[PDB]
Amino acid sequence: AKSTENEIPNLIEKMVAKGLNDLVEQYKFRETTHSKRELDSGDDQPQSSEAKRTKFSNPAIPPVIDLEKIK
Amino acid sequence: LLDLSKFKIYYDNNHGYEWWDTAYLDEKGELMEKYDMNGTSPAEEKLAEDIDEVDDDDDDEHPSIRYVAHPLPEKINEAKVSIKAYLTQHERKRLRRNRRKMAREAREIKIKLGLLPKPEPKVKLSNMMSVFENDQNITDPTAWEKVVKDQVDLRKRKHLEENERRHEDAIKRRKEAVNMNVEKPTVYHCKVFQFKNLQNPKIRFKLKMNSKELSLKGLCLRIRDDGPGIIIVVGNEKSCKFYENLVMKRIKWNEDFELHTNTGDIKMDMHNNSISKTWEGYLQDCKFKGWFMKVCNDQDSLLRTLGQFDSEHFYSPV
């Protein structure tokens, strides 16, 4: 919960980003379960690269951020 | 003196009062007596605290008859193996559809409003004749061909290059990854095999290298080089299984082989030699620090070696 509080906006988009990250870490079976995402975050931790890919995923999973930037 | 010794040995052999093929049975009495004395109560260590004491109708005070204990049940620290959540085929498809779609959208935006790249027509040798966006299609026909073929090569090359890159990166990861993974092993599968002989080099080599590969803790001890010996193998279950397979299916122990030496190459016919899986269990703590193959001059020595891991019990003399 603490972890979620600090870095994680804990919406659907964030979850998606997290999922993507684990796939890029090198997943096969759907990464891991998420009770409140904390577990997932913990699992990711071994990879040790969280904050970059969510700032990338919003540019892709919609293009709204990109549009904003343009404007 | 030597002769005398030999004679003595022979005598011992015919009917030993206690022989170390099978450990000694006979119960020493003195020790028992001592124990009894220590106890002092005619009963045992267990009952000693009742100490010939009687309250009312035989009852005791130092251990209380009245109370029933409910001691703290020690919860074992179960390792939270986060479950591999799978996906339905359909779910997977949906995921693929959505991510890819998103990517496409991004590209469109970043090729329409962005104009960061520009999408050129993907020629081939069949499109060659019908693509006119890039000029020179009949004007410079061989040049055009070169361009198109070249483009194709690049595409193919790019694909291959990408693959190569992937291979590289994966390789880089793996070394680091292995180093990183010093996980705490919860339970260890073990298998102990014993054999009549292994004067073959090849078999020994196989035992070594495979063990090294599989992080397989254990050992391979034996008596008098040509004599019978034990393999102990310990590790993760799959690895153990693999090892077992290697021992039994892959290696032919009864097969004939050549010993290479400085004097001359000795052919070894060993139809007598064979292998049996003695154990196939789970050990509480794996005290085997690595895979320390050995030879010993005698059985006692071997036993001692085994007991360096507080486990002599693995060897089965038959």
Place this chain on the structure above:
Amino acid sequence: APNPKAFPLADAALTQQILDVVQQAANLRQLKKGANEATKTLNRGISEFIIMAADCEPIEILLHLPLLCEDKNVPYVFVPSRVALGRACGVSRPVIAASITTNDASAIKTQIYAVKDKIETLLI
């Protein structure tokens, strides 16, 4: 917490292994989801081992399968989660029973055998 009559419940790692096997089985068309299919498999003799769900409620819709297995001498487990089992099988919906079936020529034969052995060990 899981039902007592759901026995033998597989240990975490074991459960995971079983799930993996099922997934492999699903891929190979070696697996048969669901009570009725599982039952059919048992009748046939094709079943190698039967994987049930502890969190099947009402549990007693399940509890014939174990009996059948016993009468057929087929290893059987419960895993804890029906949902998980379903996922493994490749079905978003709750599956409660499944059968990994026999097919000698499978790639995953060895895996299946291992799981069977594990299940047997559990039983007593």
Place this chain on the structure above:
Amino acid sequence: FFTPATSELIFARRFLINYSLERSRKRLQKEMERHQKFNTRQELLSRRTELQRMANLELAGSQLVSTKPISAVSLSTDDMVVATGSWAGDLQVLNSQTLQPLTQKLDSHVGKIGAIDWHPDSNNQMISCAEDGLIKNFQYSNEEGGLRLLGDLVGHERRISDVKYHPSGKFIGSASHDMTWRLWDASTHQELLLQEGHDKGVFSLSFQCDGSLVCSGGMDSLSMLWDIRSGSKVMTLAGHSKPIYTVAWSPNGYQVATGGGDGIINVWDIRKRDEGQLNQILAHRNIVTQVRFSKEDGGKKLVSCGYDNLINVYSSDTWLKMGSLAGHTDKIISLDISNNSHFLVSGGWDRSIKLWN
């Protein structure tokens, strides 16, 4: 820690202490006598002979029994008949040597039979347990019928694994997949103990033949040694990794032997204060199902069956595989050794009782 009491228990506890103590003393005396009169050669020779005999046991007769497999096989104190509980919940009894049935009794237990124990007092009020979640006394007859039940004892909530009769005869131990193991009265058929001392179930009880100390082999791998009298323990979980599916004393209080799921039979609770295993034993490739000894009546000889299709015999000083018994086609789930001589009667997933001679 968390310590209430009961009056019935107290009443019984004193009796237990008396009985245990006197018998224990007698045993000790016997032991003393034995060493005093022993000599290196003859005893050793005898032991060797015994070992040889054990080795050259061969599968004499296999009588099939039940629809499902035979959980329990228990020879009588008289050793004339054997009682054999299947998973079906029927405890058919067989005249041991010929191995022909006397009767069937399906209506008794609805669940899987756990273990059967004949009463150590000759008068055969054999107890049996089940997943049914209750223990049942059966007064046995040769002439009139086969069996007739006396007392059911509904205390355990969950499925029971194993019951035993405390050597006295006045008490029935029952250990179950619930946390507790429970000691009962033979007379009134009501409880007295319940030792909540395991994070999971108690899969096996075994009373020391003096009637003092009971080993509770748990599914946690915490094999606890409870003094009945004190309600307190002298335990070692450090033996096993997997569950402890069986436990049994060498009749000489000298040794407990916990057989495991790990496969390793650990043998301990020794004169030694450090409580160290004089040895472990590698019993069966797969799990161990039953471990027995047979110094009641004769000499001490470990015999064990497992999910490996192999009963096997170990000398109880050395602890060494003196010889396997190929006999069962499939898994072996129970095994009893003849009190008097060499005559094993064991049952399994072969769904047959098998003799060795």
Place this chain on the structure above:
Amino acid sequence: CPLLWVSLSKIDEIDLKNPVRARSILDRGLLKNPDDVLFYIAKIQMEIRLGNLDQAELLVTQALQKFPSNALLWVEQIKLFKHGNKSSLKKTIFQDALRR
């Protein structure tokens, strides 16, 4: 040589009325060599001969598990089916046998 074992079993069962001994003998034979299916088949046959059919079925199943392609086992199974406890799952069983 399973044939000898089979003969012995027959002698035990038929001539003298003690099936148990025969069964034991069969078991011993099986243990002495688990590579061959013949022993298993013999055992199955023996079981069939006496009243016990569930046991026979179980044995057959076991045999199949060990060696699936062996036609004698399949034949035995078919025979068992024909007895008429099921009288159903019959055609399917036949099909399965054919496949294997």
